């Protein structure tokens, strides 16, 4: 029927957080190693991924209650979900006209052939694009896109997490917010929330295929030396 004060505040800082960690002009991309079209795009794309990981953390540090989880749970959540939040947040640069991420002119317009030259096979990129297409096609609001990312970050079923009772509770409070938001403030879409939860299941499958290609890549020194320290730490198997 209505949104509560606590729930309006959960929405406000989530939207603000995303605004503090997402630049719709992509003006920092000039500071990355330049794109080159055997894996000539890996330097740039590792730098892009490493940048975004930093972004995903600053966002995560502002999700209500994340800060209060023990350090090991904050780490466990960010380690398993980071790539999924990157796929989710990447949707803002994806374009249906060109079927690509358009972060700039010809340099920063990333297509499937490009991400191939960063070491990823069709078996991951073919679902990723279809996920991007269907996610764009839901025409989410700022408030829903940002709830979706926080709901993804707070999944209790990640390897490593220890206090899955409390993480469960934080994620259900956000699912309450999203469901209330969609009903009160989203004219259409009675089935939209069920569709958004489906998108989470898709990202789990994306997460698994990525992990395999990344494990294979990270284990090859000629390629792992083109990665960044942060990428190797967040996507790597340490504890």
């Amino acid at each position: 029927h209505m949104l509560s004060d606590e729930q309006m505040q959960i929405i406000n800082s989530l939207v603000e957080a995303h605004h503090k960690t997402y630049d719709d002009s992509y003006s920092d991309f000039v500071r990355f190693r330049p794109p080159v079209r055997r894996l000539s795009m890996l330097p740039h794309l590792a730098d892009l991924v490493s940048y975004s990981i930093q972004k995903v953390i600053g966002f995560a540090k502002m999700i209500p209650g994340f800060r209060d989880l023990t350090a090991e749970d904050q780490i466990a959540l960010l380690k398993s979900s980071a790539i999924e939040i990157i796929m989710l947040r990447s949707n803002q640069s994806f374009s249906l006209e060109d079927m690509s991420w358009s972060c700039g002119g010809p340099d920063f317009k990333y297509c499937i052939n490009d991400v191939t030259k960063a070491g990823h096979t069709l078996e991951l990129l073919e679902p990723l694009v279809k996920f991007q297409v269907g996610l764009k096609k839901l025409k989410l609001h700022e408030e829903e896109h940002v709830l979706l990312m926080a709901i993804c970050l707070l999944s209790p079923d990640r390897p490593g997490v220890q206090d899955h009772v409390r993480i469960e509770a934080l994620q259900d409070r956000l699912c309450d917010v999203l469901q209330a938001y969609i009903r009160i403030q989203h004219p259409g879409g009675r089935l939209l929330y069920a569709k958004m939860i489906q998108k989470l299941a898709d990202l789990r499958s994306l997460n698994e295929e990525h992990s395999k290609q990344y494990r294979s890549l990270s284990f090859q020194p000629e390629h792992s030396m083109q990665l960044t320290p942060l990428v190797l730490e967040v996507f790597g198997s340490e504890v």
Binding site: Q54, I57, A71, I75, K79, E233, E238
Partner: peptide, 10 residues
């Protein structure tokens, strides 16, 4: 441990 992840988390 995770020195870089730790540092980014204030």
């Amino acid at each position: 441990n995770h020195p870089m992840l730790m540092n980014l988390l204030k």
